[PDB]
Subunit: 471 residues, 3 copies
């Protein structure tokens, strides 16, 4: 009696031709499980900003005085609409361009470049209520130029970058609301703010205008930035309205990653792929957790499950008509294999090797790399943002189809592999016994001679032979 396996499972798979097919064993290849924690990345923590925007951090807004500030990070954590940036109303040129820069960094380090002390001939105590530190008229920590007395000589300030690393320098211009607030502030009138490097050349003038009030002020500050190379000097020259640096940022990077909008908090675990909902210690080719991962991640997919069949049709008591065919049922009373007698370890190991290989081919072929996914855009980059979105929308489709289908096409194939293995085991046995048995038709052979147990192992050996001279 040849037969096949059947257990207490009720896992269901789908094949190209049938669905809701109950199978003995099955493997899922859709990661759908995070862990709600935010982690280091390949050993390197994010940059946690709580409720500071990169802008408020670098400028040194009084409200970011106490922030983590790790010297090296893999990505950045930032709350969707942080609240704490330019406490002095204004704006920031090429902002996003800069955030994609600081998203990931090999080494960061503040340094003093244009000391507050050295701008004699110029007031430096300038400040604003809006940038007040506990009922005190302060200002941006890292910034610094008003008239001293009734005079405003030109301002010159310079810095040959000797720090052995490229440096991020930030500066700005004051836009008053009034020609009276102008002379009351810089005495002169047709004023400019000039910067210069080996690769940068910029001459902004202020733009005076009536404006609505914000954090108390009708006036704004407009900041810009740049990347002074090593051994390159920068230059400043202004006849009024220059907000100067005092500090630069020695920045050595890296690989460039991306920012993660998130509420949570670093938790001191470890992952290779991190999502807004949590990390994902996984090895599957696909996942459906959240679109906005950072790291080396499986491919996002619009499924709920991708169940692969590994075992056979579970039939307690096809394409080759043996399983659920002429062998009408599975034996729940066979446990040491998938096919056997009344198990056969030759074919079982073969088909165990078979399925294993399959499940490996699906997985180990899926090449994956460190992407960032979530990008940063401004109000005049909607077009650009959508473009990104059409693409990720577009690979979403391509991957979801190849995956729903891969599974259905390989599931009907796996079901046939088994059918055919049971079919060939019944055939291996047919052409050993031959005349010495009645072939019943349920996959059973009745012995026309007397068959003891040694005679039973020979048939399992493939050794039956064959001194029968009986009707």
């Amino acid at each position: 009696c040849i037969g096949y396996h059947a257990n207490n499972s009720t896992e269901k798979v789908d094949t190209i031709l049938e669905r809701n097919v109950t199978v003995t064993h099955a493997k899922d290849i859709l990661e759908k499980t995070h862990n709600g924690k935010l982690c280091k990345l390949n050993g390197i923590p994010p940059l946690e900003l709580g409720d500071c925007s990169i802008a408020g951090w670098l400028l040194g807004n009084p409200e970011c005085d106490r922030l983590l500030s790790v010297p090296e990070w893999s990505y950045i954590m930032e709350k969707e609409n942080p609240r704490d940036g330019l406490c002095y109303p204004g704006s920031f040129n090429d902002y996003e361009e800069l955030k994609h820069l600081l998203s990931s960094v090999k080494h960061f380090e503040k340094v003093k470049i244009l000391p507050k002390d050295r701008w004699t001939q110029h007031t430096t105590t300038g400040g604003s209520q809006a940038c007040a530190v506990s009922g005190n008229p302060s200002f941006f920590r890292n910034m610094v130029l008003t008239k001293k007395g009734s005079n405003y000589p030109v301002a010159k300030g310079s810095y040959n970058n000797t720090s052995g690393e490229q440096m991020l320098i930030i500066w700005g211009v004051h836009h008053p609301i009034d020609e009276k607030e102008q002379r009351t502030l810089y005495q002169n009138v047709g004023t400019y703010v000039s910067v210069g490097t080996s690769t940068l050349n910029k001459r902004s003038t202020p733009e005076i205008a009536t404006r609505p009030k914000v954090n108390g002020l009708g006036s704004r500050m407009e900041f810009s930035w740049t990347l002074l190379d090593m051994w390159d000097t920068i230059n400043f020259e202004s006849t009024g309205n220059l907000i100067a640096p005092e500090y630069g940022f020695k920045i050595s990077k890296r690989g460039s990653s991306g920012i993660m909008k998130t509420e949570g908090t670093l938790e001191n675990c470890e992952t290779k792929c991190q999502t807004p909902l949590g990390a994902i210690n996984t090895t599957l080719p696909f996942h459906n957790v959240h679109p906005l991962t950072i790291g080396e991640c499986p491919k996002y997919v619009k499924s709920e499950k991708l169940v692969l069949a590994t075992g056979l049709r579970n039939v307690p008591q096809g394409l080759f008509g043996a399983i659920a065919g002429f062998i009408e049922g599975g034996w729940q009373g066979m446990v040491d294999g998938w096919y056997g007698y009344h198990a056969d370890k030759e074919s079982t190991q073969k088909a165990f090797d078979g399925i294993t290989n399959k499940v490996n081919s699906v997985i180990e072929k899926m090449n994956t790399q460190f992407e960032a996914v979530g990008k940063e855009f401004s109000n005049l980059e909607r077009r650009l943002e959508n473009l990104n979105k059409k693409m990720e929308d577009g690979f979403l489709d391509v991957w979801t189809y190849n995956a729903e289908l891969l599974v259905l096409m390989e599931n009907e194939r796996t079901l046939d592999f088994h059918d055919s293995n049971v079919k060939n085991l019944y055939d291996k046995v047919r052409m050993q016994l031959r005349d010495n048995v009645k072939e019943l038709g349920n996959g059973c052979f009745e012995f026309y001679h007397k068959c003891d147990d040694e005679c039973m192992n020979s048939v399992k050996n493939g050794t039956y032979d064959y001194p029968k001279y009986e009707e």
Copy 2:
């Protein structure tokens, strides 16, 4: 007396390919490529486009007198525009951040024009300024929605003007800066020389100076008019200050959106049909995974594929009058005379001939084929995309990115689609082959000794087999008091 196994054949000439063969006539087939529109442009999800005809978005908003009698709905889903509309900036000039402005307006949950800075309140300045370029029936005019502030008398007092946005929606606002050809034209129009046009909101700041210059004449003029725009927030004020050269807004636009869509470059006209997917040639009412109508869709569309046909086989090999060597194998032919199923019996008898389909397996197989077709169709995720994008003369790189991309998806989809058919087709045929082979076998292990197996899928009974005994064979009930002859 005898019984024969066989399969179906019909008058079909439909051809499929498979991985191994080509031009293979089959009994049935489903093509899964959409290639039919209705040549009509329609509402999208129940919502009309914005029909501009030969107006540009710029001409529309500024109120070029040539756009006076336009449709103007309160809410639209996409925008219809010709390829080079003509009626735009009747007065030569330009429009900052124009492309962004259209992606913005490309879809709108609600639009509304509202007078914010009444033309009349600008005392001290002349306001009736107009031009031949913006001619209305011979008479010099100007943009319906703008105000040309010029000197009054010999005087141009500093011009101030506010609007606190109370409208309860975000408001689109536009303005312009006039650029003369001539210090003389500049003194004539504004009297003052060192002029500026300042504009500020809560997040805006922009002091513009007029760029006077000699330039070629356009529509009659060397001067130009440079427009910019902004979104004023709720409860936010906008401030205009000018000592000369300001083209002020008389109106604003309450705008609430929505989800953002795109602009369909066409010649046609809305026709009051309905659709979930629109193309420039016509709308697509379809349910298939792939289409090849036109690359520039808007809506929820099938994947665009560079194929002429995608015929999936549903029936068997048509062989009138494989992997399991049954169909086209030892059963050499199909029975055009067996019409109630895919696989069945013959049976010859001294009570008569007659075909008969094995209904059990014909059903098993119909279900399975239905599922295959549905698998190919139903696993196809489809989202709302606009496809056609808008780009400037200095964005040829950025344009060519969008192209290289939509191009790459053309290649993926086409390969996969074409291959997906060939594969599932070599499988469809084997499926039917196996189905037959197994019917044959079921009968063979029933009759065994009591018949001669001819080898053409036929069984010659050694004993007499009446109709009741024939049915037992189809039943699976053959059993089994036979003996003769031998």
Copy 3:
């Protein structure tokens, strides 16, 4: 006897279920061979710049004098950091766009538009050490440095109505001094401007004087901009100081736009439909792995080392349990076909291939290979793009994209082989099993079915009777016992 073919092959394929499976024949469908040469593309040369940048070329840096300069090109060859560019320190507005534009050109032509000589009242021979020609201060061949004449600098005016019948590339520049003093020395006037206007252009520039680091000897800089002047359209220059004027223009007609190949090599007069920085690819296969930065009509770039499709059967010197099953071995001695017969006889032994099925199967395998190759659509793409320091986001989009197509194509390609390979082997297995069956239902009783794919006749079988079995003509007066 029924049997199948075996040969001295050691080629291995994988399939979904097995690996390292020696087969009789195989086709690898991955292109991985160039010719190490850079070539014309569809019959049209690149533009060879050597160590010149596009900027250095157009402005006419004296160090770019003796360049190739063809009238029509298909792509552009440039080193990675050319050196010969803006010999006079400065910059170039919208530079990257300008190169995508010039990256392919149906027709180019330099034409003198504002003859250097006509600028009376201004000094014109202005030059510099930075743009040195053999010790002597010079300047861009294609530009004109308008400086004061005497102690006077009259307002400078200049037009060109574009009659050339083609669109014309025009460039100019604004000088930026270090010093109000250098500014009075060179132009005498202080509140200066450089105005330029066409039918769609407008741009009044002011010179940004400033203290800056010295470069090539200078703190001053020269900022260049450009435009496309239309047919029958005029361009107007107006300056009260600081204009670097064009003496020449460029008639340009294009075409289709291509891209720039960053290489060290040099054009070699071969031909190709597909060029890579390592060499050109004359190929016909769907996938390749040579180098990601192609230009032309290329196979899909795939991160694989090999893609071996199986064409023949399992080499044995399956799913239907025939090959490597009850027919335990292959016959290295059967060379005229994939599957055939043995036949032992008192007239002799001898192999023989069943030609009918060997042919059926060859056709089917040919088609498989062609299906994999011929359904692959392929368009002209440039792949390598051009980006500025403030476009790192935009650059990283292009990358994340070409990266995603790397993943898709690699997966599909690798898997596509493994699948069609577990099928190719079954195909052959079935082909055999069925040959065996055809013979078994012919002989039936008249032989003993050994079970190794062999048949022992109970009767005498001569050569004519053997052929009847191969024919399908066995029939059938036997008896014996």
